[PDB]
Every structure is written in structure tokens, then in C-alpha cells.
Amino acid sequence: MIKRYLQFVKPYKYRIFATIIVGIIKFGIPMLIPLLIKYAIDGVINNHALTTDEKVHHLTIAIGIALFIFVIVRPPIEFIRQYLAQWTSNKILYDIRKKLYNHLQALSARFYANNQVGQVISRVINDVEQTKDFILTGLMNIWLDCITIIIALSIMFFLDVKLTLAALFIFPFYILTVYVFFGRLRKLTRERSQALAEVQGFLHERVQGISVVKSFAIEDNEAKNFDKKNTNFLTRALKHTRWNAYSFAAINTVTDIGPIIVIGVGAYLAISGSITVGTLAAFVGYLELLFGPLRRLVASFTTLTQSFASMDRVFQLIDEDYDIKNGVGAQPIEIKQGRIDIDHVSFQYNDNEAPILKDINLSIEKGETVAFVGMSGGGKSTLINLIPRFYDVTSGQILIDGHNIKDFLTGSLRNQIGLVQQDNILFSDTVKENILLGRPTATDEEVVEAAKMANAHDFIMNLPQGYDTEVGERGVKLSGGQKQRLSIARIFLNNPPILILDEATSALDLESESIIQEALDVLSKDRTTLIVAHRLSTITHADKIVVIENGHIVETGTHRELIAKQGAYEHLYSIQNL
Amino acid sequence: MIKRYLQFVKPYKYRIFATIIVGIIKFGIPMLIPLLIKYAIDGVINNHALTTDEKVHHLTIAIGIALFIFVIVRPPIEFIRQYLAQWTSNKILYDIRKKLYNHLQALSARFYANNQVGQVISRVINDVEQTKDFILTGLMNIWLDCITIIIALSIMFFLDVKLTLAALFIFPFYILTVYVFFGRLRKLTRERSQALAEVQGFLHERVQGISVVKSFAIEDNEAKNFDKKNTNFLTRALKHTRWNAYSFAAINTVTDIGPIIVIGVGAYLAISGSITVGTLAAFVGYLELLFGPLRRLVASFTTLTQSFASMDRVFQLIDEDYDIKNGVGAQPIEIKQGRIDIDHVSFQYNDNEAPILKDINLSIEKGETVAFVGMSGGGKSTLINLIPRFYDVTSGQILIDGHNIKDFLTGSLRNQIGLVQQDNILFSDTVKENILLGRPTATDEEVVEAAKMANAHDFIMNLPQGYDTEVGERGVKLSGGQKQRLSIARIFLNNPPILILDEATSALDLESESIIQEALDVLSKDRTTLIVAHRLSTITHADKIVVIENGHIVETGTHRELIAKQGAYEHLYSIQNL
Numbered sequence A, B: 001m002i003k004r005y006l007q008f009v010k011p012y013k014y015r016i017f018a019t020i021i022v023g024i025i026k027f028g029i030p031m032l033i034p035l036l037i038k039y040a041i042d043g044v045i046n047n048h049a050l051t052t053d054e055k056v057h058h059l060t061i062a063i064g065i066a067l068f069i070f071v072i073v074r075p076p077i078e079f080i081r082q083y084l085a086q087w088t089s090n091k092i093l094y095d096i097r098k099k100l101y102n103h104l105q106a107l108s109a110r111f112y113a114n115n116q117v118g119q120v121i122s123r124v125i126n127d128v129e130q131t132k133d134f135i136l137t138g139l140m141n142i143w144l145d146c147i148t149i150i151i152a153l154s155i156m157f158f159l160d161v162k163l164t165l166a167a168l169f170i171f172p173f174y175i176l177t178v179y180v181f182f183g184r185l186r187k188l189t190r191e192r193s194q195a196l197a198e199v200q201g202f203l204h205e206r207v208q209g210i211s212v213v214k215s216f217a218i219e220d221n222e223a224k225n226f227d228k229k230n231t232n233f234l235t236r237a238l239k240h241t242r243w244n245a246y247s248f249a250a251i252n253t254v255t256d257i258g259p260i261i262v263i264g265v266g267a268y269l270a271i272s273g274s275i276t277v278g279t280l281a282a283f284v285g286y287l288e289l290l291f292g293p294l295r296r297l298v299a300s301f302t303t304l305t306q307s308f309a310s311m312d313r314v315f316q317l318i319d320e321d322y323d324i325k326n327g328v329g330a331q332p333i334e335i336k337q338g339r340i341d342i343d344h345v346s347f348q349y350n351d352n353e354a355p356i357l358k359d360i361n362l363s364i365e366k367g368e369t370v371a372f373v374g375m376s377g378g379g380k381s382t383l384i385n386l387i388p389r390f391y392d393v394t395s396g397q398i399l400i401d402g403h404n405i406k407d408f409l410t411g412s413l414r415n416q417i418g419l420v421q422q423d424n425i426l427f428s429d430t431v432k433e434n435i436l437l438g439r440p441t442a443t444d445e446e447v448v449e450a451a452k453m454a455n456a457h458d459f460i461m462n463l464p465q466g467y468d469t470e471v472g473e474r475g476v477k478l479s480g481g482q483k484q485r486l487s488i489a490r491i492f493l494n495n496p497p498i499l500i501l502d503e504a505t506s507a508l509d510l511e512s513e514s515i516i517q518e519a520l521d522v523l524s525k526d527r528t529t530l531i532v533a534h535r536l537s538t539i540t541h542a543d544k545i546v547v548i549e550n551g552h553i554v555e556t557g558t559h560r561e562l563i564a565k566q567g568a569y570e571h572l573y574s575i576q577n578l
């Protein structure tokens, strides 16, 4: 998996090597200070053989050299070091999200039917952000602390063989301890993030559905439900905290026995006649070089553990399966004559549940306008959505122009099916911007046409700022009949070969309906049109009315014929002016 | 404003003092090492008074002691120090969100009509989280670095009053520099966060409206729109980064001239007689004590700057005004007889725009069932929503039982108005859980009753896992007629004195409608009922039909009478059979 995440860093290797290089070229600076203390002390006064005009000159080139380095060289190193580090990771994150967003847009209705927006977003934003440390603390810092440890171990190896050994004794345990915690922290972090994710999901869902919370004044009740999730998150976060605290003390207690098992030994050797009490003096001086980095790495460790958890969650989301896939055979197909064929189609949203569409057989010739009617919960919408291939038929096949829906390239198929769903969507944008969804590359002229078509153009003008009026989030700032008509607009703009209208009149008064009815009868003149309707009267003119009951096609016919049959259809119609 | 944020920390002062105390009791440890070293070296090795059996002995007491401290005392200090620090801040955050969520639930339809969920959430989650550093780096660490600076400075002052003035020389500039950057970083951070906020808002809106993006296969187009926001965020984040890098190098270059100017003057002063090398050398070992903390504080500074930006944004959201406020006169009023009076009401959603309801006068006696009908975009919904007081009338007054709506306590008023909006809501929960929204404290028996009432109980049983079937996010896993009926359920459960039904039939077939029609005619027998409808036929029985046009009441009457008048009403009705 590191290999995976690494793939994102790939195009930035150099900038990172650079960040590490400049990183090393930093320790040289802190050492310049103690080096300068020795020069004035031993090179201008303890020299004893210099003029009081000569030594007061060397101190003006040494206090000259220092200033130069620190006021000219260091600043740029400092800067670049950070800017680089950041610029790098920040571009990397940017990249990861670029990919995650396409992933999302490629998931299926199913996915989104069983997932919580807020939770998904939490991953795309928070979890990703969290993997930032892995680039910084991981690939750009950890090393410097190891380089330091090598240098140190090395220097010590010369000063004395067994004395260094005296140190390395700790090392294995240190490693063992890290290993012991790592995993548990990784989970605790994972579980923590997830909780956050769930509060995200909650906030999203409620803030957007407040209308309801407000209406029944269930604020108190819901504020509770919030606290459960908010608390859960807190709890989990504490578990996580406790362990970090715990593991920290642990790893360090080990890292601390380090200088001890050293000093102790360093004495019982210098005195036992093994080595120069100067060696002991020198060696023990470097103790900070060894058990310093080892102490930092404890922190480095921790940070990473958390980061891994995050990249987990990220990849987990990345690894989600696309339910509707294109498959090798993919083929952008032009639908020239709207010929739709539903052969023995049967649908189930899940293996466990019962099918919703059982055995459906229906043929729709180009130009025909087919109406779908029946008790609510029958299957019309489900059936319908099988064509734009929003879900794949369970058993059977649907063919447009003889071509199996599956053999089209998604975008192609879908782009040629103008679909007005029953629960229509609007983004917090401008009226124009919303219609444009039907055909983003459209002439401000064509838009206004669609509008006039959908019987929308008129009320749009009466809107403050007309076609540029910002509709509300979710399109709140408009009537039902109004939102709806904008959806119809999109259709005309799309001007597709196949038109599916699932209750495209729901919210319009009798009059507006009449208009749109005419507008459509026109657009639907020579196109294959599928219509789901409850307001029968606006379906009579259909070429064929299809009655659907409990997932089955029960009746088929012309309004006229169906009425004669005094069957299922008539029953329903008959309920109107009776 | 710090005072504000502090108010959240208040109930945790002690835990924080504690965190600081234990914090100080830490420097004592690192010093024990060199002490065990000096003690070994200068104490046992060169005592010139030690039996080889004594020195070894006194060495051992120094180690047995070391191990004890480090393997027993330190671990607990380390732990508590962190656990404390975290536990504290983490509870504080928890608290802040507890408050933010109630704030949210108290904002008005307006607020939410002009705000983006994702953006709001970003604040409640991200910005808050960000204020975490302020508690940690701010109130628990900064101090230790100042304590260190005091300790250090004192020593310098007693070592030489005029050389500490060679040090402190830097101090003012340091302060000046911080001041110079602070502000700009605060903004850059602010602007950065906001960008994130906007990507949040984008992701929310799109992920939830994908149905549309999928239908027109506008994935590519939208993926672009995403990249604008994603890029914007990246850019802003870079600006921020660049400056931090910049300001960091700056403040340090200043902090670095520090040890130098002590050496520049200090050395010159030794020459002229200020003091000797014995002093210049001793005034230089502690240099790390002074310009060490000053270097850390540079980082401490930065972190805080960002934190302030965050608390800004947080408070900004906290400072949002409640459009619908209760006001002192608040009074939980029982509505005993649904008498509604609309006296010269006029409504405008904004001062700039044109009113939507102009001069409306209508009286509704207890028990009466009043229907509202008219072209779409007329004002019915708006009018209606003025009663549950979702917005306050602009000019006029609405009185229930003689009491002005404004004089009720929100929850009271709203709780007694059973409202079925046209765009009904469902949470990703169970069927039961959703109905329960109407009356959270309800008998599993009463629920099933409401269901049977709303003509829902039946199809709910046919659902996998029946009343416990998890409907989809937003309630996707159900038909239109199905979601809707659950909304109707809530009404029966609420069983209020006043019932408002805005197109409560939109998605039901003719048959289901008949049922619910009967179910309601019953529940509406002796209750004040307001109905907005487009399917006229389901309104005929009304006590009074009110026709609304361009924000006005144009006609008033009994279906019978209005039909006779051959006016506005008849026109519309007349369009059904015609």
C-alpha cells in the first residue's frame, strides 16, 4: 500500500530529494554557533601574540562572517526548505482529490443509495488531508533523524567499540515496543476518523433536512441524536489519546534506559582500567546525538501511525466497485431510431430481497409514445431507470436499436436519453446555470428557447435578476411547478432521441400543465417517448398505455381499448370523474 | 474575542493549570542526565578521596537512582502530561460543537436558503478542530518557553547588566517582525479555510445531486467545475504556505543575530575591560537557553495565527442572527379552537425584491377546511409557511385564537401545526424512525396506527425488514407515493389542532389518493385545515376555496358558487374535462 500512496508522490520525487538535501545542509548551521564561541575565546585572546588592533580586526571579519552566513545564506535555506516541503505535499493532496472526485462521479446509484454524503466527504477531505503528515514527517524528516543516528553511532564506533554496544542494547527493545503499539494506534485512529465521519454524515443530513426538524419542533430530540454521535466521536478520540499518551511514555522509558546503561558502563570501564577517562568524557558527550533522534522518532512514529490509518480509509473508498462498468466492448453508439426492446427483464435491487420487476416483455417502436401507469410502488420508475442503465437488469436484456444497452458506452447511452425524474434536482446556482445542465455547451439563445418551451422563460423574467437569479440551495427559492419546469427545460436543451418523463407534471397547476402538454406533444411528435403518470388524463393520447401491478405488466392498450376492457385500467381512470 | 473562546475553556482551568505544572516539572529530567554525567566524571572519577570500592559504590547509588527516576517516576509524568493536555482540549472541542449544533437548529429557513451546507459543516468541523492548537500550543506550551526565557535572562542580568543589553537588543525587532506578519497570515489562513469550505460545499451539493450529473453524462463538465474549486483551494493554500515560509525565515534571521551581537560586543568589551573571558565565556553557555525558546516561539506564533483565523470563522458563524426570534413575550399557548386570521398580510423575502403576498385578508373559523388554488408561483406555499411562522410577515398580522403568531413560543406554535410540505423529507433511517419524527415519544402501536391511516402500513410490511426497513439516504429506497405517504403518517402521529397540506398527494396514483382522501376527510372532520392543491377534484368538498393569482386573492367561494361565477376558478376547473 505504501507503493500505492507513493504513486501520487512519484512526479515530485526530485522536489522531495531537494527538500531532504537542503534539510541536511541545516545541521551545519547550529554547529556554527559553538564554533564561533571558540574563535574569539581561543583565537583573539588566548592566542596571546596578537596586536590589540590586529585582534580587534579579526573579530570584525569573524563578526563579519557570521552575520553574512546568518543574515544572507541561512534565510534562503530556511525558506526554500519549508516552502518546498509544503508546496510539494499540498500539490500531492490536490492531486489525490482530483482523482477521488472522478472516482465518486463514477460510483453508481446503488453506492449512493447506501452511503452517507457527509461520511464520503469526510474521507475525500479529512482523511486525505491527514495523509499529509506521511509526506512531511515520513518522507522528509524521519531520514534526517536516521542520518543523525548513523553519524552518531559511527563517531561512537571509533571513540570505542564496546561503549557504543553499551548503547545499542536498547535499540532492539525500542523497536519491539513500537511494533507492539503501532497496530493498536492505527486502529484507534481509524475508528476515531470514522466517528468524525459519522458526525459529518449526521450534520449533512440534518442541516439539509431541517425543514422537518423545524416543523415538528423536534430540535431537542434531534439535538440529542446529535450528542450521541458527537459523544461517540469524543469517546473514540479519547481512547486514541490515552493510547498515544501510553505508548509515548513507553517508547521513551526504553529510549531513556539508553544513556543510563551507557554512562553506568562507561564508568565501570574507565575505572576498571579499560579506557581513557577522556574517552568516557568524549563519548558521553555524544549521548545527545544518539538518544535525541531516537526520542524524536517516537513522535515521528506516532504521527505516521495516524497517517496510515487515514490513507487506509482513503484507499478503502478508492477501492469501491463501480456497479455499472463500461467493459471492453464499450462503443459510442448513435441511436438513430428510438427502438427499445425489453426482453424478459427481471430486476432485484439485492439478492436477499424479492424482485421488483419480474418478467417484463415490451417492445417500443421509434416514434411511439408509451405510458406507464399503476398503483404506486409498482415498478414504473425502477423499470424506467433501467434504460439509462442506472442499474443493470438482473435477468434479461434491454436493447435499443438492437444494441444491448450494456454495449453502449455509458455517457453515450445516457446522453441520448432525456430524463425528467420525479424528484428533480437544482444546484444553488443561477436559473440559466441550471438549465445549462441539460447541454453545458449551449447558446444563451438556445437556453431561452428551451425555457420558452418548458413554459419557464416567462416567470424567469419576473425573477429578480431574471435568468441570472440565483435559485436557492437545492433550488428552494422557486415554486414546485417552477423547479419542475426548469427540469423540463433541460430536456429540450438536451433534445435527445429518447425522452423519459417520470411524472414530469407533479407540481404544476391545471393550466401550466396544458401548456407543457402542448410543448411536449410537439417535441414528442417523432421521438420515442416513455411516460410514467398518475394524472391519467395527460396520457390518453399515448400510443400505448401499459398498466403495471406488483412488478408486472397487467394490461396493454389504447386508452379507448383499455376503457372498453373494463379492466385494471378502466378501474383507475373510472375513479376520476366518479 | 480571546475572552469568548476562553469561556469554553473556563470549566477546565484547573486541568490546564495542572497540565502546565507537570509541564514545568519536566525540564528537571533532561538536566538529570548531564548531572549523572558530571557526577560520574567530576564526582566519582576525580574525587581523589575514593577507595576503588567507594567510587564504584557511589557510582552505583547514582545509577540505581537513575533507573528508578526514569523507569518509574518519568513515565507517569510523561503520560499524564499528554493525556491531560489532550483530554482537556478534546472535551472543549466537544463542547463547542454541542453549542454550534443548537445554533444551527436555531437559524431560519432564510439562512439555509442562502447558505451552503457543506460550507457550514466545514466550519462546525474543520474550523473548530483548528482552534485546538490554540489550547495546546497557546495556553499550555507558550508559557514554558517564556518561563525558560525568564530563567535564562535573570542569569544573564546578574552575570553582566550591560551584556544582557547586547542580547535583549534583538528582542524588540523580533516583536516588531512578528507583528508585521501576524495579521497577513491570519487573513491568508482565513481565506484558505474558506476555500476548503467551498470545496466542501461543492462536494456536498454534487455528490447529493449526482442523479442529474449521471443523467446528462455531464461528469466531465462538472469534474471541471470541481477542479476550479479544488484549484482555488490549492492556490490560496500555497499563498498561505509561501508567507509562512517567508515569515519564518524572517523572525529567525532576527533571532539569529541574537547570539552574534552578544559575541560582537561581548568580545569587544572583554578587550576594553568591561569584564574578562571568565565572564564572556560563561555568558555564552546559556545562549541556548535564550535564543532557543525564541526560536520555538516563532513556530508557536505561526500555529496560533492560523488558530485565530479559525476561531474567527467559528465565531462568525456563531454570530449569525436568528431571523425568527422568540422575544420576551414568549408564551407556550394551547390552541383550543383553530381560529386563524390573516389581516392585511404582505410578504417579501427581501427588501430589494417585490412582495410575493401583497394584501391578504382571510378568516378561517375552527373546523373549516380551506383550499388554496392558483397558477404555480402564485404564493400559496409562501402564504402557508407564514403560519408556522417560518418567515415573519412583512406588513400585517396573522392571529391564531386571537393571539398573534409572534406571541407564541416557536416550538409551541409549530408543534400544533401538522405540516405536510410539497417537497417532503426522509432521513436515512428506518421507516418507523421516520414516522416517529411526527411524535418521537410514540408507541410502536400508535405508529402502526398512523401508518394504517396514511395508507402506509400495508406496503411497509411488504418491505424487506418491514417497519424496520432502512429507507435510503434522502429516502431513495421508496416510491414517490411511498415517501409521501410516510409524510402523511407523521401528521396523524402529530395529531395537531391545525393541519396544513401543501399538495400532499403529488405522487400518488388515483386509487391511493382516494384512500388518503377518506383517511383525511376523517381526521379533518373537526380540525382547521388549510390545503394547497393543483388536482382540483380533491378540493371540491372544501368549505371555502381561495383562488390566488400574482400574490393576490382573486376569488373566494364554494366549489358550487365559484363554478357558477364562471370566473377565475371555473376557468381552471373547466380545463379538466375540456
Ligand SMILES: Nc1ncnc2c1ncn2[C@@H]1O[C@H](COP(=O)(O)OP(=O)(O)O)[C@@H](O)[C@H]1O
Pocket: A113, A349, A356, A375, A376, A377, A378, A379, A380, A381, A382, A532, B463, B472, B476, B477, B478, B479, B480, B481, B482
Ligand atoms: N433506490 C432503491 N433501493 C432499493 N429499493 C428501491 C429503490 N427504489 C425503489 N426501490 C424499491 O422498488 C419499489 C418502488 O418501485 P416504484 O419506484 O415506486 O415504481 P413506481 O415509481 O412506478 O411506483 C419500492 O417498494 C422499493 O422497495
Ligand SMILES: Nc1ncnc2c1ncn2[C@@H]1O[C@H](COP(=O)(O)OP(=O)(O)O)[C@@H](O)[C@H]1O
Pocket: A472, A476, A477, A478, A479, A480, A481, A482, B113, B349, B356, B375, B376, B377, B378, B379, B380, B381, B382, B532
Ligand atoms: N426559499 C425562498 N427564498 C426566496 N424566495 C422564495 C423562496 N421560496 C419561494 N420564493 C419566492 O416565492 C415565489 C413562489 O411562491 P410559490 O411558492 O410558488 O407559491 P406557490 O407554491 O402557491 O406556487 C417564487 O417566485 C420565489 O421567488
Ligand code: NA
Pocket: A367, A368, A369, A524, A525, A526, A527, A528, A529
Ligand atoms: Na413520441
Ligand code: NA
Pocket: B367, B368, B369, B524, B525, B526, B527, B528, B529
Ligand atoms: Na375540517
